[PDB]
Nucleic acid binder design. Sequence first.
DNA 1: AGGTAAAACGT
DNA 2: AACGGTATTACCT
Length: 200
Amino acid sequence: QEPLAAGAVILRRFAFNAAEQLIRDINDVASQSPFRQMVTPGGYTMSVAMTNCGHLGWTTHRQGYLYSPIDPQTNKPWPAMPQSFHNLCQRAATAAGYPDFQPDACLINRYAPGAKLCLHQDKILRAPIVSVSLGLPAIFQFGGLKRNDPLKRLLLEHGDVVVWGGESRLFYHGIQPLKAGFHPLTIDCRYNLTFRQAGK
DNA sequence: AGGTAAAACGT
DNA sequence: AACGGTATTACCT
Ligand SMILES: O=C(O)CCC(=O)C(=O)O
Ligand SMILES: [Mn+2]
């Protein structure tokens, strides 16, 4: 449990023991709602490929960003949140000092070599974010409330969990372009799980 | 009024 | 290649 910011902590290798099962469940989720690279409102295809599980999934469309109960690619509900995901999330939230967190949304990100996520805030209720890294390492940027607030850069390795909330809830953060490499469990990619409470 | 796109090129 | 401009507006509710 390392002090990233007010309300924020990195729990290194927290999910290491759970990771094989987590990855099996990512595969099961994506067999129903496939990974897709979404298109921004501005018309650019994101380098990260995404899917979701739980009641609500994050998606883009022409008018903005949206949490939706329906996957617009399949026209069916997102797959149910795996119990492995929910149990890990709750354990990590508890360890980070957010014992009452009840997520209803899990965004699954797959990073191939070169994929990034430019600095952004998680907007759209005042609950924490629990963010689980799997596979290849990546450099995570964590800033402040303003885009030009100085950035901490942290290598996130397989099994690391970052939790933010309270004063750091809306802080800008991001992922630098993924370096190529090998990981025994994911082979050639990084996955992240982002748990939120997106609904009432 | 106030929130949201940019979760996306030049130096 | 780290930093910051752009939304310094347009278009919604
Ligand atoms: O991949 C990560 O560690 C961060 C992902 C993220 O910020 C998001 O999906 O909103
Ligand atoms: Mn985010």
